[PDB]
């Protein structure tokens, strides 16, 4: 490559794996969104919450791929595994599965940041700091806030609480 | 007729029967709307939901009648039977009765579409496709969404759930 | 299902397979776009042409999934195979591969339309007619137009022709 | 100094050397720009490309000098060597010489970042991350893109390709 400078093969490969993780996460959120659009589930605010996360994860993949090209690495795409479930249970089940997913993405970001630090790749480290690490902290805090509110609403009237959360917390 | 072309007597008669079904449906929704306006029922959002459907069904009759004349058929009106009930129970009862009604209208549309196909009447088939079939699919999906939300809200506090649904889902 | 009416299991399954085809096509176009963004390829108009098609194919998947739910079918997601190539050759190679891809999607649309016709499912048939069949004819005609212009430009100065096509036909 | 804190003599000296490198780079780009303004070269877009880089490199020197004072170091200026050539050949020769120059500046930035890291100087490290490292990656990617387009245009009509690149890629 005519432009590549200070860009390790280890980082290049890890960036391609992270793209696969982000596209997998977008696919998971596409499935979560359409589950909540089912006539027998019918929680529009939950559907919109996940549809917006699907778009954000797709765009994170796009940012990584643009950066891969800016550094002179080579995008390599692998098969995308389907999401882990076909039906996602309650809003509480879904929000728990989303937090597990985001913590897995955050660990992948932190691992890549540590590789970049070890490789003395400050552009890579800055890039994750500027566009990914704080977005992930903010999203996980918001999901944690939502989990607490959902859990407070279960009581012994689970249906009522799930309706009220979707109506009064989620955007619709 | 000076304009009639490719318009079977079978379709003409079926269009007149469908007009009767739509006007019957408008009458049913007029009754449902005024029931929810009773001082002893008093669910304004439910009243407005049905009043708007009464208007839409009246206008579907109008579209069919305009088309009958555009094709050179003859509008023929029959007696309009009263609605099936004088009192409509809970919002849940009413929304169940509305879904039954819409599925009966949708089957009548599909039956007429199949007659038009058998008669090689593509204008009739297009006309139903363009102004009726998707509107019915969309309305039935919305009613199904509403049924699921109403059912989630019953729990063991039926009054509270019926108030909250009317206040937080239906327009008022 | 409380809403499903006139919606065959055969159509439901074929719609889920078509969603997989559209998401595969979006993935193919994501790969084509990032290939043309490589510093050693560097054809911005070609990159933008494919990036826009990736978005359109993603949105076709979304329309199909929304319709699946409107009809009371169940979205089921499968693994997404990676694109057929890692490197896409010349603009001419890429545009040939895109036409092959679009004709495969168009055949899948026509096959699903024929199943819907056989199943007397006019809503499905209308849905494909209204949102997919003409978009595919228009796109294939545009790709054919582009292929002819690219082929005229090869001559014995292939580099010059590929630059001029990207500069004077494609949006940048 | 009344303000200096955590600012090593090693960093102070390296910042003064980097200022000299940036001012040398500005001077190189001033020479490249005026070469392309010669009546016997006459490539206005190439002239404007280099004139804009001369201004950007001057301003990078300014940012470094402002930072040196903000940290309580002392600006020290050395002689500025003339550019490496008096005549710069073809646009291709010039763009190759520019990429070599930018990679030399990028290595100097990465070296200074590594010194700051070793000295536990996070303000210096942040400063380079925020104002220099990504600008250099973006510029090198753009130059690489331009090199590829220039190389595609040489064919066996070098004059025609150099005209077309200047007319259709570079701003004028
Ligand atoms: Cl899997
Ligand atoms: Cl009666
Ligand atoms: Cl494969
Ligand atoms: Cl010298």
What is the C-alpha to C-alpha distance for residues A171 and B141, in angstroms, rounded to an integer?
Answer: 21
Give the best residue of C121, C122, C125, C131 to mutate against chain B (max B CB count within 10 A).
C122
Which chain C positions have a beta carbon within 8 Å of D152's beta carbon? 159-160, 162-163
Percentage helix, strand, coil, to 5, in chain A? Answer: 75, 0, 25
For chain B, which residues lie within 8 Å of any Cβ of chain A, measuring from their own Cβ? Answer: 141, 144-149, 151-157, 160-161, 164-165, 168-169
Resolution of the coordinates in A?
1.5
Separation of alpha carbons B37 and B40, rounded Å: 8
Chains D vs B: touching, with 3+ CB pairs under 8 Å?
A: no
D109 Cα: distance to centroid of ligand 4 (angstroms): 22
What was the experiment behind these coordinates? X-ray
Q: Taking Cα atoms as reference points, which of B42, A23, B155, D161 lies closest to residue C31?
A: A23
Phi and psi, residue A43, nearest 5°: -125, 85
- 3-state SS, residue A3: coil
C-alpha to C-alpha distance for A143 and A140, rounded to whole angstroms: 5
**Chain B interface mutation, best of A35, A42, A90, highest count of B Cβ atoms under 10 Å:** A42
Q: How many helices (H) and strands (E) does chain C have?
A: 6, 0
Chains touching C, CB cut-off 8 Å, 3+ pairs: A, B, D
Are A83 and C77 in contact (CB < 8 Å)?
yes
Residue in B117, B129, B141 nearest the CB of C70: B141
Our answer on whether A and B touch (3+ beta-carbon pairs < 8 Å) is yes
Question: Looking at beta carbons, which residues of chain B come within 8 Å of C66?
Answer: none
Sign of the dihedral defined by the CA atoms of residues D101, D104, D110, D116, in that order: negative
Distance between CA atoms of residues D59 and D62, nearest Å = 5
Contact flag C82-A79 (C-beta cutoff 8 Å) = yes
Report which bound ligand comes closest to the CA of D85.
4
Does an H or E element contain B94, and which?
Answer: helix B91-118
| CA–CA dist C110, C95 (Å, integer) | 22
Q: Positive or negative CA dihedral for B8, B13, B16, B20?
A: negative
Is the CB of D137 less than 8 angstroms away from the CB of A69? no
Q: Measured between alpha carbons, how far is residue C80 from residues A31, A83, C22, C25, C106 in Å?
A: 13, 10, 10, 10, 19
Query: What gap in Å lies between CA D23 and CA C99, rounded to an integer?
Result: 52
- Residues from chain C contacting residue D144 (CB–CB below 8 Å): 39-40, 42
Tokens of C26: 């979006």
| B42 contacts: CB under 8 Å, gap ≥ 6 | B36
Ligand 4 centre distance from Cα of residue B98 (Å)? 89
Q: What is the DSSP string of D22-70?
A: HHHHHHHHHHHHHHHTSTTT--HHHHHHHHHHHHHHHHHHHHHHHHHHH
A104/A84 Cα distance (integer angstroms): 14
Contact A2 D138 (CB under 8 A): no
Q: Degrees (nearest 5) of the Cα angle B105, B108, B113?
A: 130
Angle among Cα B152, B157, B160 to the nearest 5 degrees reads 85
The Cα–Cα gap between B33 and B27 comes to 10
For residue B87, the 8-state DSSP code is: S
DSSP state of A110: H
Which-ligand-closest: CA of B85?
Answer: 2
C163–D152 CB contact, under 8 Å: yes
How many CA within 13 A on the CB side of residue B160?
Answer: 12
Assign residue A42 a region (left: φ > 0; alpha: ψ between -120 and 50; beta: otherwise): left
Q: Which of D141, D143, D148 to mutate to test the interface with A (most CBs of A within 10 A)?
A: D141
Nearest to D10 by CA among D73, D60, D69: D73
Centroid of ligand 3 to alpha carbon of C20 (angstroms): 13
Q: For tokens 């190679």, what's the residue? A: C93
CA A20-C35-C157 angle, to 5 degrees, is: 170
- Calculate how far, in angstroms, residue A34's C-alpha sits from the geometric centre of ligand 1: 19
Kindly report the backbone phi and psi dihedral angles of residue A68, in degrees, each rounded to the nearest multiple of 5, phi listed first.
-55, -50
| Beta bridge pairs of residue A80 | C80
> Distance between CA A37 and CA A32 in Å, rounded?
9
Cβ-based contacts of A30 with chain C (< 8 Å): 65, 77
Question: B165 Cβ partners below 8 Å, 6+ apart?
Answer: A163, B91, B146, B149, B150, B153
- Return residues with CB closer than 5 A to ligand 4 (ion): D 81
Closest CB from C65, C75, C83 relative to A77: C83
DSSP C31-80: HHHHHHTSTTT--HHHHHHHHHHHHHHHHHHHHHHHHHHHHT-------B
Contact C39, A72 (CB under 8 A): yes
Longest dimension (CA), chain A: 65
CA distance C50 to C48: 5
Q: How far apart are CA D151 and CA D92, in angstroms?
A: 7
Helices A91-118 and A134-154 sit at what angle, rounded to 10 degrees? 160
**Among chain A residues, CA nearest to D103:** A5
Of D149, D160, D164, the CB nearest to C42: D149
Say how far apart CA A86 and CA C69 lie, in whole Å. 14
Name the residue among C2, C37, C82 with its Cβ closest to that of A78: C82
User: What token pair was written down for B91?
Assistant: 């919002």
Contact yes or no for A121/A162 (Cβ under 8 A): no
């Amino acid at each position: 490559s005519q432009i590549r400078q200070n860009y390790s093969t280890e980082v290049e490969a890890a960036v391609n794996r992270l793209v696969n993780l982000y596209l997998r996460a977008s696919y998971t959120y596409l499935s979560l969104g359409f589950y909540f659009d089912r006539d027998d589930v019918a929680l529009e605010g939950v559907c919109h919450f996940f549809r917006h996360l699907a778009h954000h994860k797709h765009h994170g993949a796009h940012r990584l791929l643009k950066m891969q090209n800016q550094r002179g690495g080579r995008a390599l795409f692998q098969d995308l595994q389907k999401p882990s479930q076909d039906e996602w249970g309650t809003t509480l089940d879904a929000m728990k599965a989303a937090i597990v997913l985001e913590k897995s993405l955050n660990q992948a970001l932190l691992d890549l940041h540590a590789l970049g630090s070890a490789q003395a790749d400050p552009h890579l480290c800055d890039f994750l700091e500027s566009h990914f690490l704080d977005e992930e902290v903010k999203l996980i805090k918001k999901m944690g806030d939502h989990l607490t509110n959902i859990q407070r609403l279960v009581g012994s009237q689970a249906g009522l609480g799930e309706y009220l959360f979707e109506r009064l917390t989620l955007k619709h």
